[PDB]
C-alpha cells in the first residue's frame, strides 16, 4: 500500500467503531511505532500487509518492513516539537524544551505534554525536521500530569 514518508494513525475495528490505538513514522520504507501500540501484530496499508522486522518490549519500540532507520538525537539544549496526532483530531506541532529522566544507565530527554494514550507513537523533531524519538512511554508525576521520554532506537 502507501509507503510515502511521514506520520500515520494506527487504527483497530476490534472495538466499537474505528479506534486510534497509536501513531507511527514511515521513513525509508520502514514503519516505526511503540511496542505497546501494535504488540508486534502485523498492520494493513491499502491491500498491502506490514510484518514486524525488529522489536524490544524494554525499549518499547518496533519496526515494520526493515530495520530501525531513525538515528537523530536531542542535543540536550535546543527546544523540540512534538508533532502530536490525537484521536479524531488533526496533526498539530507543539513546541517545548524537554526535561530529563535520570536513570542508573543514563540521562534521557523527556517532554512534559499530556494527551490521550492514542497519541502514543507521535514523533519529536529537531529544528531540521529530523525525528529524534517517539512520545508515549513515561510516567505520571505528583500533580497527576503525564511526562513522556524521548524514546529513540539504534540504527545499523
Amino acid at each position: 500500500g502507501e509507503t510515502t514518508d511521514g506520520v500515520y494513525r494506527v487504527m483497530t475495528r476490534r472495538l466499537l467503531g474505528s479506534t486510534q490505538v497509536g501513531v507511527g513514522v514511515m521513513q525509508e520504507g520502514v514503519f516505526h511505532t511503540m511496542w505497546h501500540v501494535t504488540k508486534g501484530a502485523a498492520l494493513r496499508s491499502g491491500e498491502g500487509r506490514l510484518d514486524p522486522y525488529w522489536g524490544d518490549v524494554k525499549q518499547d519500540l518496533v519496526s515494520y518492513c526493515g530495520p530501525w532507520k531513525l538515528d537523530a538525537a536531542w542535543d540536550g539544549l535546543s527546544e523540540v516539537q512534538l508533532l502530536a496526532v490525537p484521536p479524531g483530531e488533526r496533526a498539530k506541532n507543539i513546541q517545548t524544551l524537554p526535561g530529563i529522566f535520570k536513570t542508573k544507565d543514563g540521562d534521557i530527554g523527556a517532554v512534559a505534554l499530556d494527551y490521550p494514550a492514542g497519541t502514543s507513537g507521535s514523533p519529536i523533531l529537531d529544528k531540521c525536521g529530523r525525528v529524534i524519538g517517539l512520545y508515549g512511554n513515561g510516567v505520571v508525576i505528583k500533580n497527576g500530569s503525564y511526562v513522556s521520554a524521548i524514546t529513540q532506537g539504534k540504527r545499523e
Binding site: 514518508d5 506520520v7 514503519f31 494493513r44 518490549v57 508533532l83 517545548t96 530529563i100 535520570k102 525536521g129
Partner: protein, 39 residues
C-alpha cells in the same frame, strides 16, 4: 487487524504553540519497559 492512515508530513512549523515545562526526574525502567518515579 490494525491498519495505518497517513496524517501529515514531518516538518518543523515556525510559530507553533510553545508550551510545557522541563522537569528533571529520577526514574527506573523495569524489564517490562514501564517507567517509574525513583523517590
Amino acid at each position: 487487524d490494525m491498519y495505518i492512515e497517513r496524517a501529515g508530513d514531518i516538518t518543523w512549523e515556525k510559530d507553533a504553540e510553545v508550551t510545557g515545562n522541563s522537569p528533571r526526574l529520577d526514574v527506573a525502567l523495569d524489564e517490562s519497559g514501564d517507567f517509574s518515579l525513583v523517590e
